[PDB]
């Protein structure tokens, strides 16, 4: 059950937003990565 964000540093699916902060859960690190769609993406191999 889900993904939304990721911790640049301590590697660990977080998921949160607004009044929530912009930090973490078990590394106190202020940098976050958005995380891949599930819409599937296709490539021509050319």
């Amino acid at each position: 059950a889900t993904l939304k964000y990721i911790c640049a540093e301590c590697s660990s699916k977080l998921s949160l937003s607004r009044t929530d902060a912009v930090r973490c859960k078990d590394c106190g690190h202020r940098i976050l990565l958005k995380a891949r769609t599930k819409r599937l993406v296709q490539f021509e191999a050319r």
């Binding site: 640049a8 930090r23 106190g28 202020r30 940098i31």
Partner: protein, 36 residues
């Protein structure tokens, strides 16, 4: 100097990413003594 949770070792990888300023601080050793 942080936004809240405050004052922290900075490595260069984060300063780049955070638009930070890879700085250190300066402390002097000051003296009051009296003369007018």
């Amino acid at each position: 100097n942080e936004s809240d949770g405050v004052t922290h070792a900075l490595y260069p990888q984060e300063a780049r990413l955070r638009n930070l300023t890879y700085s250190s601080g300066l402390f002097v050793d000051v003296k009051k003594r009296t003369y007018e």
